[PDB]
């Protein structure tokens, strides 16, 4: 239970997140060890008027935690405990614990399961705070419908710290607190310590009333030369990856059980990478992932080279995954979001096309498109924070890199292709169309600016839609002395 | 503490280890949550003369953990725990414990470090019982110079089974049992559930008796592609490399603060890979990084492609580290090892290229040059069970891949290789001339075979040396059933 000022060499560290583009530059860290130990922290802090914010896994995309300057920050991946929940069935997780470090605990202990995102050193912290979904989402939902309780340090009217518990039962003002926390975001309301996770009834099995782990997973990684492919097979090619995705997304449908990731990586990296997995519980033979790999190229001159096959739950999973290591680690990155009910038109495709062939050194320049609806969709938009209840593909537009001295370079070339791409709806992925806005996980400043968005809508509809009033009230309610606040906190 | 059966859905992973060539298959597998457990855990099972096997992180290159079929295995995981030593100088670490969360916890507590390995998800059971060496062992030895203290569960002649503390400091048995643990290797004495760390006092700082971590690391990966390089460059290149060890290898020496990683891939990848890392406290601007770099390819046409820059402990050591993510999950491999004392010959430098552009599908093979010496050499052969204290370059002769039905094509690749690139002294890197054998935590079973091995020289001369007969010894006095065995253990 210690503290880290600038004088301490560990300070250095800490005071980068993953994005080395900003900077979390604090008068000292405080790394808690318990629940009490954020409250009697928070305490301190607040009423000597010193500003404060947390992190939890530091993956933020935005420079949400040390801006603007903080006198202290709480960093939390003390608190990660996993056990089974004092009261009733579910699970307890601290909120300092990693996706890596609750997959292993869930799988080891229970056979379990949760739909956690894809990167094993993501922050429970914030990613449950924003929605959370990943390659089992089709079959399990979002993370925040797992969601039963919350334990959060939160800060009244009176400068007075209180460690609350909000449960999916509860009414009034802590039931306006519990559903806060199922997709407003991180940085808002508190310090969350803990989150309590009880799925619904019908995903729910024993032994702790969380959803089973599949027995094997169909794995396949495929790999598309960019140099066998033109614009108009390109064109082909993501036109039908939508078009299965408009066909297949809705919830209990046997396609459900497939996922795939798809990375339109920028010409310089040679390749397009195709992902796909299949639980292979409800599909021995990987009949429907196959059939998914030969539609995407079947009338088209491309040819894939394909690598896998069938693996046991956890070596499957982080086959799939990305960890802490190699190439992703140390860098400066910008990443935008879109929500897709149906296809892009082929115009936007073509966009997409040229964009993908500029002179620009995009070696880790590209945009993913993600599997999402099943599950996810069965939910109505007001039932959690999290408004986008019915698209079937999510894409995050993403650049990577080293010098600082590049930075402009490379978020021309994201804002320039976003901004085209979505021209015919003021540069941005508007709500109820063809698109339905964007994911508050992965933060975009750029939301905020007249010259990057045109269309009217501003940041928080495109996030929060008609959920933003109610996380207004909560915000008054619970965070009255707006003691938790960035560049993009709920008003 | 749990069980898992074949009956239960967990079974199917924990029947997998790292390689994939190998199953893990037994009656049961134990979970336990303390040393005790293990200790109930295997009275249990001896005196019913039920056969044991132990596994903390499951990297073992070789068949070990499940071979020959055992009835119950002793998953470690669980046994993770990381503390001050009680005590009161230095750490205490389960053996179920990662290198990743044993680096955090160093740095994060303590600013400290130690000299573990550039691979994220291996145990500390079988990494410190091997030896164990990494980017920072030409600073701070190998992990068994900082070893204190190990706690053991060991089975006597009378099927009795106990948990004994053998420390660095004991004479008699226990000291001998200490001994066989800096360096025996795993799956030969017991099963290890702790080791406590304190460092030799001119490495140890405050406030627990570790080495400090650098404040900062230059980190430089430069790739190479093979296009550019004809057989005579790659000889070059590798001959400086190799030279380049031969000069700056001493203890002490400024250029100890500098280790390099040498991927020198199959054609089929495209490129050689080329990892380097510097102490920034002793060398702010990473002169001597620089001036390595620009050294290996001066004379030839050769460009490198070269990323990089100044990071923190923590993320420059994950920058250049192995997590347990992507292709490397999953997938069946072979590896060989070998200690060099000095460079190859050029002769032998050709073989290897020439091997490096056969026809096979190598996606995933390659020779791995790693730094090796500084500080490690300033030990005697016989102060640890590991021998070789005098070597500079320190080599892994890899293939990985996917499919069973190839086994045959990859080994034979491998084999291949190696058996030619050191043709000259029967196939095997001997120990005694340029080379000094092998390392027990690349176990390979190939050793054993004549085929394979015209040298004369046994495998447990090859991995221990002179050291073979204490540890013989130390195994008839600790482990008299034989409890503990594999096709690759200390023989009674
Ligand atoms: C970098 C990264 C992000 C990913 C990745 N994969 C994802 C995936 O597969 N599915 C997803 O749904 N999301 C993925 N994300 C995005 C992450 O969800 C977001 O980046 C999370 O917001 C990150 O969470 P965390 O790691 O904890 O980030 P922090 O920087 O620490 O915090 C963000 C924000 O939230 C506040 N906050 C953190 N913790 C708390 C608690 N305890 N209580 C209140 N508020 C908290 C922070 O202060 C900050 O404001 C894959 C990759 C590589
Ligand atoms: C796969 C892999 C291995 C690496 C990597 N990087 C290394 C490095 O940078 N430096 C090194 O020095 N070594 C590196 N290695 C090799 C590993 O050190 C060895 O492969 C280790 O022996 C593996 O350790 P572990 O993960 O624990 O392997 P297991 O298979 O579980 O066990 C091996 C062996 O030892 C016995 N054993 C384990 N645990 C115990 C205990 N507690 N007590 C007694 N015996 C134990 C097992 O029975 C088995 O016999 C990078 C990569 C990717
Ligand atoms: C559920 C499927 C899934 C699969 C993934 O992989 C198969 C990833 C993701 C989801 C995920 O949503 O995000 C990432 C994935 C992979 C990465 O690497 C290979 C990512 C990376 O290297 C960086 C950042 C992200 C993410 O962080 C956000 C940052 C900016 O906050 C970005 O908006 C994201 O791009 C990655
Ligand atoms: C201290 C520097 C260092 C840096 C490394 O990396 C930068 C690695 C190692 C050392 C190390 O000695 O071993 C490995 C390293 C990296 C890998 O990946 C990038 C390794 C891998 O992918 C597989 C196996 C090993 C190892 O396990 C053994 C298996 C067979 O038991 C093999 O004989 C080894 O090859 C790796």
Redesign the pocket.
């Known amino acids: 239970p210690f503290t880290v000022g600038r004088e301490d060499p560990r300070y250095i560290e800490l005071s980068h997140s993953d ?1 080395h583009r900003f900077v979390v530059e604090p008068e000292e860290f405080f790394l808690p060890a318990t629940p009490d130990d954020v409250v009697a922290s928070l305490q301190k802090a607040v009423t000597e008027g010193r500003g404060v914010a947390c992190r939890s896994g530091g ?3 935005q420079d949400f935690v040390g801006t603007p300057r903080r006198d202290l920050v709480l960093d939390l991946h003390n608190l990660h405990a996993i056990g089974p929940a004092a009261d009733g069935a579910g699970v307890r997780v601290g909120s300092g614990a990693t996706v890596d470090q609750v997959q292993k605990a869930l799988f080891r202990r229970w056979n379990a399961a949760l739909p956690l ?3 094993s050193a993501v922050g429970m912290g914030g990613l449950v705070a924003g929605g959370g ?3 089992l ?1 089709r079959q399990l939902g979002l993370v925040v419908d797992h969601l039963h309780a919350v334990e959060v340090a939160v800060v009244d009217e009176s400068r007075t710290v209180r460690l609350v518990t909000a449960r999916a039962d509860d009414t009034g003002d802590l039931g306006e607190l519990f559903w806060a926390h199922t997709g407003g975001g991180g940085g808002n309301f508190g310090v969350v310590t803990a989150y309590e996770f009880r799925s619904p009834e019908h995903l729910a099995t024993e032994p702790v009333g969380l959803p089973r782990a599949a027995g094997r997973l169909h794995v396949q990684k495929v790999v598309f030369p960019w140099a066998m492919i033109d614009e108009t097979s390109f064109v082909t090619v993501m036109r039908r990856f939508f078009e299965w995705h408009e066909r297949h997304s809705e919830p209990g449908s046997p396609e459900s059980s497939l ?1 795939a ?1 798809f ?1 339109v990586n920028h010409v310089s990296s040679g390749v397009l990478q195709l ?1 796909v997995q299949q639980d292979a519980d409800v599909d021995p033979e990987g009949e429907i992932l196959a059939r998914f790999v030969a539609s995407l190229t079947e009338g088209t001159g491309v040819v894939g080279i394909p690598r896998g096959g069938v693996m046991s739950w956890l070596t499957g999973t982080r086959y ?3 960890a802490d290591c190699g190439d ?1 680690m140390g860098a400066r ?5 879109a929500y897709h009910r149906a296809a892009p038109t082929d115009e936007q495709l073509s966009v997409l096309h040229r964009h993908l062939h500029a002179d620009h050194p995009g070696q880790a320049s590209y945009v ?1 498109f ?1 599997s999402y609806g099943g599950e996810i969709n069965r939910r109505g938009p007001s039932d959690a924070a999290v408004p986008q209840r019915d698209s079937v593909v999510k894409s ?3 650049s ?1 890199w080293q010098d600082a001295e590049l930075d402009e370079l490379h978020l021309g070339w994201l804002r320039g292709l976003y901004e085209e791409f979505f021209a015919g709806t003021g540069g941005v992925p508007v709500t109820g169309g063809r698109t339905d806005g964007c994911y508050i ?3 975009d400043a750029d939301l905020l600016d007249p010259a990057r968005n045109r269309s009217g809508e501003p940041w928080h509809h495109l996030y929060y839609k008609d959920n933003y009033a109610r996380l207004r009230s909560a915000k008054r309610a619970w965070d009255p002395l707006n003691t938790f606040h960035h560049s993009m906190s709920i008003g």
């Not at 990155?333 to 979001?337: G, I, L, N, V, Y």
């Open positions: 994005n993956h933020c995309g995102g894809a990167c979904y990943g390659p989402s996922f990731t990375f992902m799939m995954s990305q992703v990155s910008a990443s935008k979001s993913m993600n995050s537009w993403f990577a996980n992965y933060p």
